[PDB]
Amino acid sequence: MSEEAKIAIELFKEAMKDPERFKEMCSPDTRIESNGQEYRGSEECKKFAEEMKKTEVRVERYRSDGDRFEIELRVNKTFRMEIRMRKVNGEFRIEEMRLHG
Secondary structure, three states, rough: OOOHHHHHHHHHHHHHHHHHHHHOOOOOEEEEOOOOOOEEEEHHHHHHHHHHHOOOEEEEEEEEEEEEEEEEEOOOOOOEEEEEEEEOOOEEEEEEEEEEO
């Protein structure tokens, strides 16, 4: 429950700190939407992470399912971020994430 997400939340937060670590988390399934602009796939997501490197994160909301985790964050320039992740073999994949600020 709390722990898995913590790890999952922390991993994303740690991935926010390390741009290349973020590149690892992505799969071809990954879909990202930012300001009406869409990024989809392994390569495209890694390409997104580089742009995000140019940037105090607060977790406003969190939801838990065994397979998948839905997380809603506050980015602080202030923005709101929603992330959906699925746990695969002790590793976490970013199934989707949308940043609407």
